[PDB]
């Protein structure tokens, strides 16, 4: 299914949604919202399922 | 400051050809084009491809 994702949800109309909608683009860019996806999920099947 | 200017000063211009560009660049980490080579956390990473 294309095009759907998680996100983090705050109270209604609360200001600091936009802080972390940027911040989160920087911690993308760079490089290094991919480590911790490499952590939990190294994508390392030993047995095949 | 009597009379002005006699033959030159200086040279004219000492502006180095096509230097000091920067310039910011856009990529995919599609192997073996472009690798992750250093996997620092905080320090950028570099990249051998």
């Given at each position: 299914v294309a095009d759907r994702g998680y996100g983090i949800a705050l109270q209604?109309?609360?200001?600091?949604r936009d802080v972390f909608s940027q911040r989160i683009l920087e911690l993308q860019q760079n490089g290094d919202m991919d480590i911790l996806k490499h952590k939990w999920w190294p994508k390392n099947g030993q047995c095949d399922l | 400051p009597v009379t002005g200017l006699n033959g030159s000063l200086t040279d004219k211009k000492l502006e180095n050809n096509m230097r000091g560009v920067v310039l910011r660049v856009v990529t995919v980490l599609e192997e073996p084009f472009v690798m992750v080579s250093e996997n620092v956390l905080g320090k950028p990473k570099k990249y051998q491809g």
């Open positions: 209604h109309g609360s200001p600091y | -």
